[PDB]
Amino acid sequence: EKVFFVTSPIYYVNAAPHIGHVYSTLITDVIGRYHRVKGERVFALTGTDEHGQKVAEAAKQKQVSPYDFTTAVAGEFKKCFEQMDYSIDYFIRTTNEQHKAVVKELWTKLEQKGDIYLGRYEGWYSISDESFLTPQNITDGVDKDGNPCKVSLESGHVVTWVSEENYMFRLSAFRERLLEWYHANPGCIVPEFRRREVIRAVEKGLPDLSVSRARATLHNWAIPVPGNPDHCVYVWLDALTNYLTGSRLRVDESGKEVSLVDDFNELERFPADVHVIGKDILKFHAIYWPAFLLSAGLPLPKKIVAHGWWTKDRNVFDPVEKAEEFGYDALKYFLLRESGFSDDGDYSDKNMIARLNGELADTLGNLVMRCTSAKINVNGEWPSPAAYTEEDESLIQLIKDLPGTADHYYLIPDIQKAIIAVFDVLRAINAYVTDMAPWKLVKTDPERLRTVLYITLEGVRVTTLLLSPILPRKSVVIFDMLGVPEVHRKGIENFEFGAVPPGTRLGPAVGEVLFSKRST
Numbered sequence: 479e480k481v482f483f484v485t486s487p488i489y490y491v492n493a494a495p496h497i498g499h500v501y502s503t504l505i506t507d508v509i510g511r512y513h514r515v516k517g518e519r520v521f522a523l524t525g526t527d528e529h530g531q532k533v534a535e536a537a538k539q540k541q542v543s544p545y546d547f548t549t550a551v552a553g554e555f556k557k558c559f560e561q562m563d564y565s566i567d568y569f570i571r572t573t574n575e576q577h578k579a580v581v582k583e584l585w586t587k588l589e590q591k592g593d594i595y596l597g598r599y600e601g602w603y604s605i606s607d608e609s610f611l612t613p614q615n616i617t618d619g620v621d622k623d624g625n626p627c628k629v630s631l632e633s634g635h636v637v638t639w640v641s642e643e644n645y646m647f648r649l650s651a652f653r654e655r656l657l658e659w660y661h662a663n664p665g666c667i668v669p670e671f672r673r674r675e676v677i678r679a680v681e682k683g684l685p686d687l688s689v690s691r692a693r694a695t696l697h698n699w700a701i702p703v704p705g706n707p708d709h710c711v712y713v714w715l716d717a718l719t720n721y722l723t724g725s726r727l728r729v730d731e732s733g734k735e736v737s738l739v740d741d742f743n744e745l746e747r748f749p750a751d752v753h754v755i756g757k758d759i760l761k762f763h764a765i766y767w768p769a770f771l772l773s774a775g776l777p778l779p780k781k782i783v784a785h786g787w788w789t790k791d792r793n794v795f796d797p798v799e800k801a802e803e804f805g806y807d808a809l810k811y812f813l814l815r816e817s818g819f820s821d822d823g824d825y826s827d828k829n830m831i832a833r834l835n836g837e838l839a840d841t842l843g844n845l846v847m848r849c850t851s852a853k854i855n856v857n858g859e860w861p862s863p864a865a866y867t868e869e870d871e872s873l874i875q876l877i878k879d880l881p882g883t884a885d886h887y888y889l890i891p892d893i894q895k896a897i898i899a900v901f902d903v904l905r906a907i908n909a910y911v912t913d914m915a916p917w918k919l920v921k922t923d924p925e926r927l928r929t930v931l932y933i934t935l936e937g938v939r940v941t942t943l944l945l946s947p948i949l950p951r952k953s954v955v956i957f958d959m960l961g962v963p964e965v966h967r968k969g970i971e972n973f974e975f976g977a978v979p980p981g982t983r984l985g986p987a988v989g990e991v992l993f994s995k996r997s998t
């Protein structure tokens with residue numbers, strides 16, 4: 479039993495935070511939140527990648543010091559994430575002095591294992607991606623000036639030739655072990671088609687990887703190689719090490735770091751159970767990272783999950799403005815509902831309003847009000863049910879199964895599928911409620927209404943619970959309206975049908991609603 483350790487990528491600070499980072503961190507936040515709902519220990523991690531030529535040259539373009547630049551843009555990332563209302567346990571910065579120490583330790587470990595030698599890298603590089611590319615991954619294109627140039631096929635950013643004496647890591651020696659790893663743990667990369675991609679690439683063969691650069695090239699904005707101050711550590715080896723650092727940091731409740739433990743086992747976080755990443759940074763996490771860890775004699779992460787978006791890029795979205803307009807919880811819902819493992823996503827205002835109105839308001843919202851309405855629930859309490867009809871049983875079955883199903887989806891992790899599963903059950907509850915016409919039963923048959931109302935109430939409680947990682951603020955409101963005690967708002971014990979007893983009283987009236995419909 480360990481601390482469930484989930485991470486987001488750490489984002490370059492060349493520019494202000496935008497939708498892409500918010501999305502990536504959201505996914506990390508949800509996975510964390512679900513596992514806390516199951517009553518597990520969690521450590522969710524996010525932060526900023528502050529070294530390198532890319533970041534240095536952005537600070538240069540704004541005619542400001544790297545220290546001041548990175549610190550300002552970091553504060554912006556932090557402000558954005560506080561504003562987005564996540565439940566992240568720590569925000570790491572690669573400029574952190576304890577992080578630097580961890581990198582040198584890891585470097586020293588790889589060096590002592592014999593896996594680092596002085597060689598040369600002569601070949602193409604994308605500064606914007608901080609990525610080495612072979613000639614098969616470039617093509618002709620254009621720069622900001624409008625001259626003919628070479629560009630990455632990965633991303634379309636400008637590439638440049640590099641010929642440097644660099645320290646090299648023996649990546650080629652780890653090809654077979656990475657392959658054994660991919661096959662022995664077929665869940666280790668998600669979604670499955672990116673697992674195939676990684677195997678195909680490693681199958682083809684692996685060159686050694688440049689893990690240092692000449693200090694002139696990086697404008698001295700990087701961690702020096704231990705025992706060689708002429709060289710700086712590759713920004714990506716620096717960056718990937720944040721996962722290790724984060725796993726070794728004791729943090730106060732204020733969120734500030736206060737100690738770096740010698741040994742990761744001390745905090746029971748490492749290795750990560752899930753690395754959330756974008757599709758643009760797959761090779762670093764599924765090829766380079768496991769190879770460093772194997773060299774270092776460290777344990778590998780359990781899962782890498784690579785979503786359909788980019789970690790970084792240029793339907794314009796200031797996440798905070800859209801949240802101020804449509805709602806924080808609803809914006810998160812929409813991003814998680816609309817985004818599959820691809821770019822097949824419609825983020826138009828039209829479709830956002832359709833989903834807000836269609837699902838959040840009409841399906842979930844309406845259901846809460848019906849089962850809490852003074853009209854239908856005249857006693858304002860959880861009634862004790864009478865005998866169940868077959869129709870009752872069928873809905874009860876769906877509700878009884880929902881947690882196990884949603885659980886598996888959350889553990890893939892495929893949040894979209896989890897959301898869809900909950901809402902399938904919400905549609906079912908509405909259909910039942912339409913059939914039973916409890917408004918009519920209030921007069922006709924109060925005993926039958928007890929049964930119908932209780933099942934409805936319980937369907938709403940369980941669905942809301944399983945949606946609580948997605949709608950953290952609104953789940954609280956729903957629970958308050960239903961009058962569910964705090965103790966029952968968490969824990970797998972409360973995944974069970976019938977956890978909240980008959981006679982529980984509902985919360986007081988607000989009459990403000992849950993999700994107001996936006997005009998079309």
Ligand code: MET
Nearest residue numbers: 487488489490527717718
């Ligand atoms: C260890 S994850 C580093 C990710 C990189 N800074 C990016 O924004 O893509």
